[PDB]
Design a protein around this ligand. Sequence first.
Ligand SMILES: O=C1Nc2ccccc2/C1=C1/Nc2ccccc2C1=O
Lengths: 290, 327
Amino acid sequence: MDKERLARENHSEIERRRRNKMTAYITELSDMVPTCSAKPDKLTILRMAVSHMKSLRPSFLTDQELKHLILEAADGFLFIVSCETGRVVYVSDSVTPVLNQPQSEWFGSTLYDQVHPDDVDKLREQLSTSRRSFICRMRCEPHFVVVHCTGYIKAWPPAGVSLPDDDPEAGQGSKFCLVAIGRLQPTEFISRHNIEGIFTFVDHRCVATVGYQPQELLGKNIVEFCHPEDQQLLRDSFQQVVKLKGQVLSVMFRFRSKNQEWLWMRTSSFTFQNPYSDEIEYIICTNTNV
Amino acid sequence: SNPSKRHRDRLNTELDRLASLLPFPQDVINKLDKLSVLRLSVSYLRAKSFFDVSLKGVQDNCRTKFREGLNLQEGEFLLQALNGFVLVVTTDALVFYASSTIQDYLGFQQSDVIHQSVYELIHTEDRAEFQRQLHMERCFVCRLRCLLGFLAMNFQGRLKYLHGQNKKGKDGSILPPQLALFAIATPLQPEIRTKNFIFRTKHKLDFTPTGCDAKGKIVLGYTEAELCMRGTGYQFIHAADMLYCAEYHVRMIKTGESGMIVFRLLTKDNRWTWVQSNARLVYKNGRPDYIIATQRPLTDEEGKEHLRKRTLKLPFMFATGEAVLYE
DNA sequence: CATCGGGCATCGCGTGACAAG
DNA sequence: GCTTGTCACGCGATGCCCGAT
Ligand SMILES: O=C1Nc2ccccc2/C1=C1/Nc2ccccc2C1=O
């Protein structure tokens, strides 16, 4: 087939599909405007679409429509806090369907007062001095919920927003702010503990062994996961392995799995000695499903 | 003139009227074509029709003018805090909407993406998965065309009825709405000029760090004071490299030089970073005094290569995990 | 209550000029 | 200097409207 004839046929097909797309979009316009659906030609449909758009009417959506789309897609609530003091500069109404807290409990407050104390220091490392993403525990006896926060550091005050003289923000003088969204959310594994039993290193295999992620174990004491009957046995094992450096001590206990289910675990522990001072750096445990 | 010319001119005048009403800047409108004009008009009408059904403020006892101004941009604030972009896709795999920040992440103008086939922006090997999530919660990963190659992106969203789309039947009757994916798409996460970083650290004889230079503070993330209050260096070493490092520490004690070893250190971000280090004993009066380790960061790939080519087969050699460090 | 030819309007087809990449 | 695409235009086949049968 000569190339000129094939080119002409391709061009004719392109123009045909182009006209097809145009007529299909005109049909969609007829379906989208009031009294067209309730038959008109292309010109009448176009004029009625022009009138409808004129009545409806820069961004494609409004701020409220964009917020609606984002929240309908992935929940969350917006909060803008100061980097210096953590002062809550802004919090959206979405904090009520997320934390069961009114906007009053967050306004005039600080983010450190709204998170669990065990997170405060961590929070500081996320506020001092672009993108940010962390996980904390927010308030709601008191109750806490794990909240995943992701956002950014914006130079304050924001452009376009007017700051009146008699406004509570006029005297603050914050230079940067965190603008973020908060949302609600037969094998073995090795581990490293201190002399007290705190998980300082967790193998990734723990997920397949006890159902926990390594971050869920790190920092916690292993005895917290132990059955109260087996707790003194596990504690005496951790105490005796320190006195017998080099010797391997095995112990069976009941580990509380991710589903709050008891699993029989065999933990074999020994100590790591410094090649110079011969001091105990940590305790290496191999925890095996039974 | 002639009838064809006059009819085409009437059609083009109506098309220009439609183009002048599109909610886009004038520079975007002027570079549009007739097909794109009609497409974006249909898209705007469908979006307004959906929000006419789905949609409709700071608390009344907390109203200040500045907080009202922030409320009037809450949506853009959420969009900028997304670290990604919004994507609403219908059951017909048509992009019902994409937020502007898509241009920031893939290089596509939102005016060229809206009301187009979403598969045009996806890797073929991933397309079969995407429609699998198209047909309530959703959390998956797909690779999308990036004009800034491709980019792997995590999608988190839901399937919700896209109301007000006026899908008409064969009978001319209205059809019920179809499900649509409302999703937020973000990038993924796991060294630069610091490949040429050669930094030194001073240690006690038990490898307790007591000094660190500037490039060391930049690589490991600890201040010089923070690096010393966390015990010996074995608290920093990956559990897969502890016995390897201990053997080479014995070698250094028995020779004064450890040689080049490749092992993982824990940063202040609680991340693991590979280093090629060489610890040397410095003597005072013929008795050892302190260790001087001069090192170089490595990419994870060549670090894994060195670990694969380890001369000594030792326990926990191929173990992976996370760690913490306290004072 | 129709039916019937006028002349202009609608509309789909193919091709050519022209340009962005 | 090739490719894909946009826009206009010529051109008939029907569409609509409507006096005139
Ligand atoms: O080269 C290091 N840089 C560091 C920075 C912080 C903490 C430790 C180290 C290093 C060690 N090189 C070693 C070689 C053999 C045995 C132990 C060790 C170490 O602890």
